[PDB]
Write an enzyme that holds these catalytic residues in place. Structure first.
Site, mmCIF file in Angstrom:
data_model
loop_
_atom_site.group_PDB
_atom_site.id
_atom_site.type_symbol
_atom_site.label_atom_id
_atom_site.label_comp_id
_atom_site.label_asym_id
_atom_site.label_seq_id
_atom_site.Cartn_x
_atom_site.Cartn_y
_atom_site.Cartn_z
ATOM 1 N NE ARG A 102 -1.596 1.304 3.959
ATOM 2 C CZ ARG A 102 -1.110 2.332 4.518
ATOM 3 N NH1 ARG A 102 -1.484 3.446 4.106
ATOM 4 N NH2 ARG A 102 -0.091 2.179 5.538
ATOM 5 C CB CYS B 181 -1.813 -3.190 13.041
ATOM 6 S SG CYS B 181 -1.353 -1.851 11.749
ATOM 7 N NE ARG C 274 -5.163 -4.738 9.268
ATOM 8 C CZ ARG C 274 -4.417 -3.910 8.448
ATOM 9 N NH1 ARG C 274 -3.735 -4.617 7.371
ATOM 10 N NH2 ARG C 274 -4.117 -2.737 8.705
ATOM 11 C CB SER C 275 -0.530 -5.669 8.912
ATOM 12 O OG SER C 275 0.438 -5.110 7.947
ATOM 13 C CB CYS C 276 3.379 -7.624 12.028
ATOM 14 S SG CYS C 276 4.756 -7.463 13.394
ATOM 15 C CG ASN D 236 1.957 -3.784 17.800
ATOM 16 O OD1 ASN D 236 2.657 -3.664 16.625
ATOM 17 N ND2 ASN D 236 1.243 -3.041 18.056
ATOM 18 C CG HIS E 260 5.301 -6.542 6.683
ATOM 19 N ND1 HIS E 260 4.063 -6.768 6.851
ATOM 20 C CD2 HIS E 260 5.519 -5.347 6.751
ATOM 21 C CE1 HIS E 260 3.480 -5.538 7.213
ATOM 22 N NE2 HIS E 260 3.991 -4.712 7.089
ATOM 23 C CG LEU E 261 11.689 -7.228 8.470
ATOM 24 C CD1 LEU E 261 12.801 -8.185 8.582
ATOM 25 C CD2 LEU E 261 11.970 -6.273 9.459
ATOM 26 C CE1 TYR E 262 6.319 -0.917 4.611
ATOM 27 C CE2 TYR E 262 6.499 -1.412 6.821
ATOM 28 C CZ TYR E 262 5.602 -0.945 5.718
ATOM 29 O OH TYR E 262 4.340 -0.873 6.003
HETATM 30 C C1 LIG Z 1 2.812 0.077 17.094
HETATM 31 C C2 LIG Z 1 2.480 1.071 17.318
HETATM 32 C C3 LIG Z 1 2.166 2.473 17.416
HETATM 33 N N1 LIG Z 1 2.534 3.165 16.157
HETATM 34 C C4 LIG Z 1 1.544 3.542 15.277
HETATM 35 C C5 LIG Z 1 1.766 2.919 13.850
HETATM 36 C C6 LIG Z 1 0.918 3.416 12.970
HETATM 37 C C7 LIG Z 1 1.301 3.251 11.360
HETATM 38 C C8 LIG Z 1 2.345 2.472 10.877
HETATM 39 N N2 LIG Z 1 2.733 2.139 9.787
HETATM 40 C C9 LIG Z 1 3.981 1.337 9.692
HETATM 41 N N3 LIG Z 1 4.287 1.371 8.150
HETATM 42 N N4 LIG Z 1 4.429 0.818 10.658
HETATM 43 C C10 LIG Z 1 4.101 0.892 11.685
HETATM 44 O O1 LIG Z 1 4.884 0.079 12.966
HETATM 45 C C11 LIG Z 1 3.073 1.662 12.143
HETATM 46 C C12 LIG Z 1 2.865 1.984 13.400
HETATM 47 C C13 LIG Z 1 3.963 3.468 16.178
HETATM 48 C C14 LIG Z 1 4.167 4.684 15.205
HETATM 49 C C15 LIG Z 1 5.377 5.313 15.189
HETATM 50 C C16 LIG Z 1 6.336 4.500 15.794
HETATM 51 C C17 LIG Z 1 7.759 5.241 15.510
HETATM 52 O O2 LIG Z 1 7.916 6.352 14.940
HETATM 53 N N5 LIG Z 1 8.793 4.957 16.355
HETATM 54 C C18 LIG Z 1 10.134 5.736 16.496
HETATM 55 C C19 LIG Z 1 9.885 6.482 17.805
HETATM 56 C C20 LIG Z 1 9.323 7.861 17.612
HETATM 57 C C21 LIG Z 1 8.702 8.385 18.813
HETATM 58 O O3 LIG Z 1 9.204 8.337 19.843
HETATM 59 O O4 LIG Z 1 7.548 9.017 18.842
HETATM 60 C C22 LIG Z 1 11.169 4.594 16.546
HETATM 61 O O5 LIG Z 1 12.436 5.063 16.215
HETATM 62 O O6 LIG Z 1 10.848 3.512 17.277
HETATM 63 C C23 LIG Z 1 6.186 3.394 16.667
HETATM 64 C C24 LIG Z 1 5.012 3.060 16.680
HETATM 65 C C1 LIG Z 2 0.002 -0.961 12.300
HETATM 66 C C2 LIG Z 2 -0.277 -0.438 13.782
HETATM 67 C C3 LIG Z 2 0.745 -1.033 14.653
HETATM 68 O O1 LIG Z 2 0.338 -1.175 16.101
HETATM 69 N N1 LIG Z 2 1.599 -1.968 14.393
HETATM 70 C C4 LIG Z 2 1.998 -2.437 13.327
HETATM 71 O O2 LIG Z 2 2.908 -3.268 12.860
HETATM 72 N N2 LIG Z 2 1.285 -1.816 12.252
HETATM 73 C C5 LIG Z 2 1.739 -1.565 10.846
HETATM 74 C C6 LIG Z 2 1.341 -3.006 9.820
HETATM 75 C C7 LIG Z 2 1.692 -2.331 8.295
HETATM 76 O O3 LIG Z 2 3.142 -2.206 8.423
HETATM 77 C C8 LIG Z 2 1.295 -0.816 8.511
HETATM 78 C C9 LIG Z 2 -0.310 -0.685 8.105
HETATM 79 O O4 LIG Z 2 -0.482 -0.833 6.845
HETATM 80 P P1 LIG Z 2 -1.609 -1.637 6.042
HETATM 81 O O5 LIG Z 2 -2.934 -1.276 6.500
HETATM 82 O O6 LIG Z 2 -1.177 -3.190 6.729
HETATM 83 O O7 LIG Z 2 -1.542 -1.648 4.674
HETATM 84 O O8 LIG Z 2 1.433 -0.466 9.961
#
Ligand SMILES: C#CCN(Cc1ccc2[nH]c(N)nc(=O)c2c1)c1ccc(C(=O)N[C@@H](CCC(=O)O)C(=O)O)cc1
Ligand SMILES: *c1cc(=O)[nH]c(=O)n1[C@H]1C[C@H](O)[C@@H](COP(=O)(O)O)O1
Ligand SMILES: C#CCN(Cc1ccc2[nH]c(N)nc(=O)c2c1)c1ccc(C(=O)N[C@@H](CCC(=O)O)C(=O)O)cc1
Ligand SMILES: *c1cc(=O)[nH]c(=O)n1[C@H]1C[C@H](O)[C@@H](COP(=O)(O)O)O1
Lengths: 264, 264
Positions: free
Chosen positions: B21, B146, B166-168, B177, B207-209
């Site tokens: 996506r 997620c 569902r997605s990680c 998490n 997954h891993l980006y």
């Molecule tokens: C899970 C969850 C909640 N979430 C929400 C959330 C929403 C969309 C997502 N989208 C994607 N692509 N991956 C994710 O893991 C993801 C996570 C998170 C969002 C950001 C960070 C993050 O930016 N980590 C930085 C620290 C930044 C900070 O301190 O604010 C890091 O370097 O670890 C971690 C968790």
């Molecule tokens: C969403 C929120 C969180 O707690 N932890 C996660 O790993 N994610 C990740 C899943 C995915 O990498 C991305 C959401 O995209 P999509 O809806 O699965 O396409 O954030």
């Protein structure tokens, strides 16, 4: 099957005795997962003879969005008799949730049609999911969904599916569930011109009822035989147009059936 | 952590390249499960420095049934900024579904309270579940859930919880998490006078980006250190009455942090 027997043995060796809703008692474990590569064959238990007729008709019944056991009766299927009401209804169970999930605003969502369209237009999607766990309607259901939520996946042109079963009766229900979902995967794959992948089964409360100990011990001594192959005689216009007569289970040589009471 | 590092190694060893996506590209496997015995220590990744500040505040935010980032902002947590709108709203996400899942007949179900009542009055129930996957409202959500489904279990007076994600995003999201849910189990257990058990993590599209590969390998060359200890200094009247100050993590000596981009 090897994976299946290993789970049975695991329940016997690690299970905790638990008093349950039926007042029967169960050896229970929490959290288990097993993968079935569908290329290797249809995951239909051979250590005991399984009844395909009931498995196939129930699945077709689900896709119909039907919740009344009338259809099942016409085809001599009685697996839902103990939970249906005076009129044969089971409440908004699986079928209703699959084909017409009720939104708070009155609308309905066809999860299966959505899934088809997702697999066909956006296979890389990580949101291809069908849920039967409608929190807002659980009170109206005769029995809460055991196999409550599943997700599809596509990679290298292969279609995989993971099922989350919150509650599992290892001896009676598990064999039925595995085959049922494996079948759905094949139907989806055919309708989406994809090869079959893996069926991943994940469960919550996985258990063996106390009054099944002998049956289990008997099954555990039988060596598993080669897995059968599924043949789909015809490709219908849609996933909703399948008939019982379209499936063939080739090479299915199972051990004799084992009888055991059901817990209500 | 061992389980965590092994998962990363598995994704790298058996993952398939897949577009997604966000248009970034990922290495992906489908179906995985690992278990954490909470008695061994608090499952917080030590192979890289994590910050509790954001993990704790997000959970408290969830429990309030809040979906606006204002709270998070007051506490200087920006993890959800990229998805909120002009008014800071994310739509009916986690918090909303947890505390007030909308029903078709006009009701609202508070899943957290329902679960608490179950853990105390019917701990043997196989229906102690909380679901964020609301099919009928997914279209109003800033991002589909997620971690969308979880089930509680009790055995030997210990509380266990299995989560279906569902997605990680293994590198960024997973560390958060795991700690978030392990924290929820601790809070639940304290409220139900139960001991902590196992946190079972099950993943769908794990997954891993593509742009996190170097970071991943850097982390993999590190040796996991002893797990930290969680000390709760107070027992609130309810699960909704905890404060940031009530939690104390000790023995946390992590490796240096490894910064990586977030996929929006
Ligand atoms: C899970 C969850 C909640 N979430 C929400 C959330 C929403 C969309 C997502 N989208 C994607 N692509 N991956 C994710 O893991 C993801 C996570 C998170 C969002 C950001 C960070 C993050 O930016 N980590 C930085 C620290 C930044 C900070 O301190 O604010 C890091 O370097 O670890 C971690 C968790
Ligand atoms: C969403 C929120 C969180 O707690 N932890 C996660 O790993 N994610 C990740 C899943 C995915 O990498 C991305 C959401 O995209 P999509 O809806 O699965 O396409 O954030
Ligand atoms: C899962 C599922 C669907 N279901 C529904 C369903 C609903 C409630 C349940 N409740 C309990 N306690 N255990 C179950 O396995 C169970 C299964 C099933 C119903 C009956 C049989 C059963 O008695 N099997 C017989 C064959 C009966 C026949 O074909 O006429 C056997 O011995 O194989 C299996 C599955
Ligand atoms: C439910 C339906 C199915 O397809 N497969 C199953 O294994 N079951 C079983 C689980 C359990 O044995 C029994 C009761 O579940 P609960 O008490 O409502 O939690 O049905």
């Amino acid at each position: 099957m090897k994976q299946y027997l290993e789970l049975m043995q695991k329940v016997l060796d690690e299970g905790t005795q638990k008093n349950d809703r039926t007042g029967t008692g169960t050896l229970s474990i929490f959290g288990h997962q097993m993968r079935f590569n569908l290329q290797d064959g249809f995951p239909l238990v051979t250590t005991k003879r399984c009844h395909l007729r009931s498995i196939i008709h129930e699945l077709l019944w689900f896709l119909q969005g039907d919740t009344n056991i009338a259809y099942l009766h016409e085809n001599n299927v009685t697996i839902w008799d103990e939970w249906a009401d005076e009129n044969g209804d089971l409440g908004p169970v699986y079928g209703k949730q699959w084909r017409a999930w009720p939104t708070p605003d009155g609308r309905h969502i066809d999860q299966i049609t959505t899934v088809l369209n997702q697999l066909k237009n956006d296979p890389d999607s990580r949101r291809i999911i069908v849920s039967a766990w409608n929190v807002g309607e659980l009170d109206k259901m005769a029995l809460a969904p055991c196999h409550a939520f599943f997700q599809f996946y596509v990679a290298d042109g292969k279609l995989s599916c993971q099922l989350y079963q919150r509650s599992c009766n290892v001896f009676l229900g598990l064999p039925f569930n595995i085959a049922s979902y494996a079948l759905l995967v094949h139907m989806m794959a055919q309708q989406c011109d994809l090869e079959v992948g893996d069926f991943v089964w994940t469960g919550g409360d996985t258990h063996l009822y106390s009054n099944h100990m002998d049956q289990t011990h008997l099954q555990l001594s039988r060596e598993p035989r080669p897995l059968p192959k599924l043949i789909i005689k015809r490709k219908p216009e849609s996933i909703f147009d399948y008939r019982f007569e379209d499936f063939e289970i080739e090479g299915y040589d199972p051990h004799p059936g084992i009888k055991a009471p059901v817990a209500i």
